[PDB]
C-alpha cells in the first residue's frame, strides 16, 4: 500500500497472508470468506511467464495478523492448504481476466476477535455499491513505494471506484467485464494504491443497508504503484461468484 495508514487491530479480520514456506516469504494478500475457504488472485499462484506455479505444498496461510514479520504468538493461526482451485479461464496469457483462485484449508479456522470472514456480495449489493465515486478499501502488507519501504503493520487505503471509460483510456491493456479499476484521478490531489505484495487482497465495501463488509474486488494488477493517470485493477468478485459457488458446494465447506 502506497499512501495508506496502519490498520487498527481487528479492522480487517478477513485479511490473509499467503506465505512461502521456503524461502519464508510474503507472496500475496488473500481473504477468509468462510472457516475453510480463502479468496486470492490466481496470479499469486500461477504465473508461467515468471515461472510461478505454487503448489498446495509450497505454501502457508496466516490469519489474524497485524504484524508483517513477527509470528503473532497467540493471535495468528497459520494453516496448510488442502486444495487449490484456479479459475478455468484465468487469462495469464493476455490481461489476467478471471484473476481468481480459491484455497480450501486443511482444517477450519476458528473465529476470534482478529479472525472473521468477509461476506460475498449478492447481485443487489453489487448493483447498489459498485459505482464510480463510491469508495472501497484495500489492505495489505505490500510495498509502500512503487520503488525506493516495507510496512511493519497492515496498511489501509480508501479508494474511489473510477468509471469504465477512464479505466480504459488509462492503459493499452484490454479491460474486461471481470475487471474494475480504482484510484484517485491526478486532478483529485489524493493518492494511494496497492503495491507489490498487495495482490490477492480484498477490495471491500461497507454496506450502508445492513452495515456489513463485502468483498467487491480482488487486488489484481496495475502499472507501477500510485502513478498519475494510472489506476488499480481488481477482479470483479460478483461477476465470478457463480464460479465461486460452484467450487464450494462441489468439494467444500
Amino acid at each position: 500500500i502506497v499512501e495508506g495508514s496502519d490498520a487498527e487491530i481487528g479492522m480487517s479480520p478477513w485479511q490473509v497472508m499467503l506465505f512461502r514456506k521456503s524461502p519464508q516469504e510474503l507472496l500475496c494478500g488473500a481473504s477468509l470468506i468462510s472457516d475453510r475457504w480463502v479468496l486470492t488472485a490466481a496470479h499469486c499462484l500461477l504465473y508461467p511467464p515468471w515461472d510461478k506455479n505454487f503448489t498446495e505444498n509450497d505454501l502457508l496461510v496466516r490469519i489474524g495478523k497485524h504484524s508483517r514479520t513477527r509470528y503473532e504468538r497467540n493471535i495468528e493461526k497459520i494453516s496448510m492448504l488442502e486444495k487449490i482451485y484456479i479459475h478455468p479461464r484465468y487469462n495469464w496469457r493476455e490481461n489476467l481476466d478471471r484473476d481468481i483462485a480459491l484455497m480450501k484449508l486443511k482444517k477450519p479456522v476458528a473465529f476470534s476477535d482478529y479472525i472473521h470472514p468477509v461476506c460475498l456480495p449478492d447481485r443487489e449489493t453489487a448493483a447498489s455499491l459498485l459505482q464510480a465515486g463510491y469508495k472501497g478499501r484495500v489492505t495489505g502488507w505490500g510495498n509502500l513505494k512503487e520503488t525506493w519501504g516495507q510496512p511493519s503493520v497492515l496498511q489501509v487505503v480508501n479508494l474511489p471506484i473510477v468509471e469504465r471509460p477512464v479505466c480504459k483510456d488509462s492503459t493499452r491493456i484490454r479491460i474486461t467485464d471481470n475487471m474494475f479499476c480504482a484510484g484517485y484521478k491526478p486532478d483529485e490531489g489524493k493518492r494511494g494504491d496497492a503495491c507489490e505484495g498487495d495482490s490477492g487482497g480484498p477490495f471491500v465495501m461497507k454496506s450502508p443497508f445492513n452495515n456489513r463488509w463485502y468483498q467487491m474486488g480482488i487486488v489484481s494488477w496495475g502499472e507501477g504503484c500510485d502513478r498519475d493517470g494510472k489506476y488499480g485493477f481488481y477482479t470483479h468478485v460478483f461477476r465470478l461468484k457463480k464460479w465461486i459457488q460452484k467450487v464450494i458446494d462441489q468439494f467444500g465447506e
Partner: peptide, 10 residues
C-alpha cells in the same frame, strides 16, 4: 527480517 514460525507448521 521475517521472524520464524513453528515447524509444527513448516
Amino acid at each position: 527480517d521475517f521472524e520464524e514460525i513453528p515447524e509444527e507448521y513448516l
